[PDB]
Amino acid sequence: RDKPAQIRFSNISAAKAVADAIRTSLGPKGMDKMIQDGKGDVTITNDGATILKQMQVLHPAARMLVELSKAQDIEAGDGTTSVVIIAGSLLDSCTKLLQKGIHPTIISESFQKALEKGIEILTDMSRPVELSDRETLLNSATTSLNSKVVSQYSSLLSPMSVNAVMKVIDPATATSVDLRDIKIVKKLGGTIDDCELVEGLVLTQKVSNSGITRVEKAKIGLIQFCLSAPKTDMDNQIVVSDYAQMDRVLREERAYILNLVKQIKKTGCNVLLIQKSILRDALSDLALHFLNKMKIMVIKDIEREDIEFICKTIGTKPVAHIDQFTADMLGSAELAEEVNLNGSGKLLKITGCASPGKTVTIVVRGSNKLVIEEAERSIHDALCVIRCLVKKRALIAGGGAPEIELALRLTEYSRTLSGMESYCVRAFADAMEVIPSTLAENAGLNPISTVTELRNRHAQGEKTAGINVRKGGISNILEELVVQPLLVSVSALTLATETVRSILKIDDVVNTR
Amino acid sequence: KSRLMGLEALKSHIMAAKAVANTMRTSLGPNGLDKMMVDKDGDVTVTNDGATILSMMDVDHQIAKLMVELSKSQDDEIGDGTTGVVVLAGALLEEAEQLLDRGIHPIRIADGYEQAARVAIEHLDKISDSVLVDIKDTEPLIQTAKTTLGSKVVNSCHRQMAEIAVNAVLTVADMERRDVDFELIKVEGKVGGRLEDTKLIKGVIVDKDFSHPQMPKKVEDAKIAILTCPFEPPKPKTKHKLDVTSVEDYKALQKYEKEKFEEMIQQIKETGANLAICQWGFDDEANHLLLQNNLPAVRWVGGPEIELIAIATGGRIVPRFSELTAEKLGFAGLVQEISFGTTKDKMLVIEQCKNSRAVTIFIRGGNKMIIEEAKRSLHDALCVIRNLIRDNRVVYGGGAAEISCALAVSQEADKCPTLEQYAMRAFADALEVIPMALSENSGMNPIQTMTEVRARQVKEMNPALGIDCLHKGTNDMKQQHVIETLIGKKQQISLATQMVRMILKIDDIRKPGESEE
């Protein structure tokens, strides 16, 4: 059928099509995008990273890219537009060579040896720095805190971006520094200068009110049980047809629980993290009143994040109903600390807990999530940047500028491959240098002067140099303060590689029904 | 009075070379399926190269127009590689819009292509042998006329023409000091003989006039007498009333005929060359009454022929029979009466070693088609050596240089950079189109097939070997002996970007309402 023909283009098309208008990136280019959907709902969009995550796409190979958009985030946190913009670049090489009648598997074969050639030359042009060296951790994060949300605040975050790691980083070179490693928890209130590196496992949680424990020596709780009480876990001997009977069942409830909440405390507990679920209501809120009065932190229907970290970093297990007391399997805690800064937010700070040699916590604070996310998004990549340096060392320039060094150097090996793929390997070795030109894209008229100048002058940077797409002008892009870890783009290659290759693997007709 | 815009027009221009170069792309080489022509006047025919077809085919468009225009100089000199630039310049043409589609000046693209030819030129310069000599170039012209006499009329090289190809071009070449003129060498078929009746003619060949064979057939001297005057009472190939007003004038005529016969037998012989080309027609009666006297008498001669053979001899013509000198006679190195075919008359072959200011080599045919199919071989095989003596330089062709000359240029790209690397890149690729396109017209997968000598190009350099042009299981240009005048390839090189360079010329794509009108 001509469908595999027509659709593989339609695959490449609506993949590349959406992805092509997706290049405004890297700098104040084009003009702001206010999106009002096919359902007619106003959105105001910008700064394609979010837009990449915002991206709502009909057609599957377009949906492939939203994935591919998110693919770069956890792999790097940098150059997510990169893997998205270059997605068309592989999609480019497909059709032209599919037109050429090159068997798309050959084109599919053309991706790896390239991906084998390509990421290497990036490593070949890579700029070595360290994973534990606070300065190399600073600079990469610095440039990644320079154009990211906070900079003045990053001056606090950049070291914490670094300081979090030296905990998390396992000795010298080690596979390390995941997102599970640095614990990033928002804290209501304060500001970013209130954002601080709060070491170990620090559980952000909603603890009922105060009169709570801010006091040292918690037994940090994990509790799957109800206090067994009238109207909580224990039978009510009183049926209510009456206001004397209805007032009776809550009194026997509230008068009873007061013993268990202290016994709850009698383990030494300044925390019991309630089961996330309900045994009936699970723990009565009338109970949770007196649990905190004995200074025991309670988050009823506890959020997922604490349960794991407390079972993970702290290593806490559920414990028996305090009628049975407990198994003392409450994880290591020397403190339950609930701090209100701005007077805002309730918290659990656990220091003196089991920790892997990882799980540094950063407690991200602000008068609103704005100030919070201001720090947060910046410090996170700064972590993820340093994370990349950890996961893969050295460096590359920011914004695909080194890819043009690759394009020159690679096309030769593409050429000198002289294989069926070499053609394809040459065709796509030339699909890189577009990316700085194509980010310039949307702004203006009398237009076209710089396009190949966004290219040629780099190609005339020898193989070592080109325009800085972040800062402007030609230099040796790899360290200009136009930088991202070597890890960042070599993934963007790999990430976009098999995605587009999967498009070449689309044949016959598929809609599952 | 409507006006296309730039790229638009070029986009309209790019619509031209595609199909017309395409016609070549399955016609390239013997593995290329040659070209057919049909007529509004009802003539179906086979066509070849660019020139034959593209002249026989008619060209709508300035692009198509320049084709025949761009084409001529090629087939004129080298004769081989004509169809090539069509694909090539058409390929580069489709590289041009491409870089305009890549947003690169029509200006600039045509710029770095020019010296991109140079890095192919210097590349070509290296390829194969920049040398040949007489006993040597015999053999490549053997090879050249192998592939010439084996690709066109017959697929069997017939060594006669294969040697007939070498000798008379040399004859004008060795006369002109390793220079030769395709005008001077001439390929003349006359059917009724065979494609195996093939003649090396360094002089003129004309049917010897017999108004009677039995009245002695002979060729005399070695030399020819070229005459506007009578060698026997004259007549301009037009009807001359023979009547006699009395029964007695019947008696005197044939005497008068013979009195001037012997007198013109006398006065042309004393002039020289009893064989005498009388521009004048004459009665078959008395023409053979001189034949009855003597000396087969050449009459009913083409007005051009006398002066044609005159200038070839370098000698003049007798304008007036009372004027008699041997310089006004012609010069035959050898006059030779030669039976033309087994089917028909003896001719008089004048082979001029005296002076040949034209050399018309000869062939016959069982059919006028095949005999011209053969001349089609002969002309261009005489055309390569034409230059190929002026420079003895030869380069193994057929995609081996195309796969190669692209090597220098596309590698020269990132040596170049800015716009030139592109104009190195989208330049050199047009070269490997043809080995692709030759593998195309073959039963072959070109990219695959191209990939092969590619590996070689990484393995080896500038293969004297290469890919099969003959579609041989073995791939050389050596085993294939596919090698073209290292002129002609570069001569061919000279053509392609020129066209693109032509299509850009001025800024005016406007038309008054006249463009092709």
From Swiss-Prot, chain A:
Q: Which SUPFAM superfamilies match?
A: GroEL apical domain-like, GroEL equatorial domain-like, GroEL-intermediate domain like
Mind naming one GO cellular-component term on file for this protein? cell body
User: GO MF annotations for this entry?
Assistant: ATP binding; ATP hydrolysis activity; ATP-dependent protein folding chaperone; protein folding chaperone; RNA binding; unfolded protein binding
Task: Provide the residue positions that the database annotates as binding Mg(2+).
Answer: 78
Where, per the database record, does this protein carry N6-acetyllysine?
Answer: 262, 276, 293, 300
Q: What is its EC number?
A: 3.6.1.-
Q: Which residues carry this modification: Phosphoserine?
A: 10, 158, 176, 418
Give the binding site residues for ATP.
27, 79-80, 148
Q: What residues does ADP bind to?
A: 27, 79-82, 146-148, 399, 484
- State how it assembles: Component of the chaperonin-containing T-complex (TRiC), a hexadecamer composed of two identical back-to-back stacked rings enclosing a protein folding chamber. Each ring is made up of eight different subunits: TCP1/CCT1, CCT2, CCT3, CCT4, CCT5, CCT6A/CCT6, CCT7, CCT8. Interacts with PACRG. Interacts with DNAAF4. Interacts with DLEC1.
Clinical condition linked:
De novo genetic variants in nearly every subunit of the TRiC complex, including CCT4, have been found in individuals with a broad spectrum of brain malformations, and clinical phenotypes ranging from mild to severe epilepsy, developmental delay, intellectual disability, ataxia, and other features of cerebral malfunction.
Can you say what this protein is called?
T-complex protein 1 subunit delta
> Which species is the source of this protein?
Homo sapiens (Human)
In the record, what lineage is assigned to the organism producing the protein? Eukaryota, Metazoa, Chordata, Craniata, Vertebrata
Q: Which gene encodes it?
A: CCT4
From Swiss-Prot, chain B:
Keyword set includes Nucleus? no
Q: Give the result of residue 152 to R, as annotated.
A: Found in a patient with severe developmental delay, intellectual disability, pyramidal and cerebellar signs, visual impairment, polymicrogyria and pontocerebellar hypoplasia; uncertain significance; the orthologous yeast mutation induces yeast lethality suggesting loss of function
What modifications does the entry list under PTM / processing?
A: Ubiquitinated by the DCX(DCAF12) complex specifically recognizes the diglutamate (Glu-Glu) at the C-terminus, leading to its degradation.
Catalysed transformations (reactions): ATP + H2O = ADP + phosphate + H(+)
**EC number of the protein:** 3.6.1.-
Question: Could you cite one Gene Ontology molecular function of this protein?
Answer: mRNA 3'-UTR binding
Gene Ontology biological-process annotations:
binding of sperm to zona pellucida; chaperone mediated protein folding independent of cofactor; chaperone-mediated protein folding; positive regulation of protein localization to Cajal body; positive regulation of telomerase RNA localization to Cajal body; positive regulation of telomere maintenance via telomerase; protein folding; protein stabilization
Cite the location of the cross-link Glycyl lysine isopeptide (Lys-Gly) (interchain with G-Cter in SUMO2) from the record: 186, 190, 241, 251, 255, 368
Q: Which residues bind ADP?
A: 29, 81-83, 151, 398, 468, 484, 489
Q: What induces it?
A: Down-regulated in response to enterovirus 71 (EV71) infection (at protein level).
Q: Its GO CC terms?
A: cell body; centrosome; chaperonin-containing T-complex; cytosol; extracellular exosome; microtubule
Q: What is its main location?
A: cytoplasm
Biological function: Component of the chaperonin-containing T-complex (TRiC), a molecular chaperone complex that assists the folding of actin, tubulin and other proteins upon ATP hydrolysis. The TRiC complex mediates the folding of WRAP53/TCAB1, thereby regulating telomere maintenance. As part of the TRiC complex may play a role in the assembly of BBSome, a complex involved in ciliogenesis regulating transports vesicles to the cilia.
Q: NCBIfam families per the record?
A: chap_CCT_epsi, thermosome_alpha, thermosome_beta
How it assembles, according to the record, is:
Component of the chaperonin-containing T-complex (TRiC), a hexadecamer composed of two identical back-to-back stacked rings enclosing a protein folding chamber. Each ring is made up of eight different subunits: TCP1/CCT1, CCT2, CCT3, CCT4, CCT5, CCT6A/CCT6, CCT7, CCT8. Interacts with PACRG. Interacts with DNAAF4. Interacts with DLEC1. Interacts with SPMAP2.
Q: What is the associated disease?
A: Neuropathy, hereditary sensory, with spastic paraplegia, autosomal recessive: A disease characterized by spastic paraplegia and progressive distal sensory neuropathy leading to mutilating ulcerations of the upper and lower limbs. De novo genetic variants in nearly every subunit of the TRiC complex, including CCT5, have been found in individuals with a broad spectrum of brain malformations, and clinical phenotypes ranging from mild to severe epilepsy, developmental delay, intellectual disability, ataxia, and other features of cerebral malfunction.
Its recorded name reads: T-complex protein 1 subunit epsilon
